[PDB]
């Protein structure tokens, strides 16, 4: 069913970020063969390349050297058996 270990939340979880440091979007799933997509609102997609952006089933998406472009509403998406599931997060730099 829902492949995400954590449950959906209507108000997005806040993630504190610091520019220039690692940023983790923690939408870990129950299996390495589930295909998960990462998007930034309104229309951007962040694709893992194994270097700057890494996907790890047990952790989520790991972005090195976060920048101002990663500040906003990020969403992980997965579809299991025709049903689309998601988890939303709001990244925020400390004042």
């Amino acid at each position: 069913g829902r492949p995400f270990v954590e449950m959906y939340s209507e108000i997005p979880e806040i993630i504190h970020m610091t520019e220039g440091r690692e940023l983790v979007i923690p939408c870990r799933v129950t299996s390495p063969n589930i295909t998960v997509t990462l998007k930034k609102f309104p229309l951007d997609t962040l694709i893992p390349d194994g270097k700057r952006i890494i996907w790890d089933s047990r952790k989520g998406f790991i972005i090195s050297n976060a920048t101002y472009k990663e500040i906003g509403l990020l969403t992980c998406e997965a579809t299991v058996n025709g049903h689309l599931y998601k988890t939303n997060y709001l990244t925020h730099r400390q004042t």
Binding site: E10, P12, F41, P42, Y68, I71, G72, L73, N88
Partner: protein, 98 residues
């Protein structure tokens, strides 16, 4: 229900192109000898928020639109003049500079 839900408020306000009523003199500052009718035009322009005081919503892709405007010069007639305006097609939140 009696309240607009958070996700809706966020998605509807975040930096994006929106119809904006713009004064023609702001776009054609060198043509103040005329009175234009209408005096303002509807244009897609970047608007909304970036939700971070150090960022601002700016255009990353633009194009032009042409519209018929009535141009009035005291005691000269008035003629219709097609005038072109800049429209924003895509926006982004970037750091403010000084």
């Amino acid at each position: 229900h009696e309240v607009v839900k958070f996700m809706d408020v966020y998605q509807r306000s975040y930096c994006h192109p929106i119809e904006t009523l713009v004064d023609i003199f702001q776009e054609y500052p060198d043509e103040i000898e005329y009175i234009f009718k209408p005096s303002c035009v509807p244009l897609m322009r970047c608007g909304g928020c970036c939700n971070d005081e150090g960022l601002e919503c700016v255009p990353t892709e633009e194009s032009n639109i042409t519209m018929q405007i009535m141009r009035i010069k005291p005691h000269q007639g008035q003629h219709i003049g097609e005038m072109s305006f800049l429209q924003h097609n895509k926006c982004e939140c970037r750091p403010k500079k000084d």
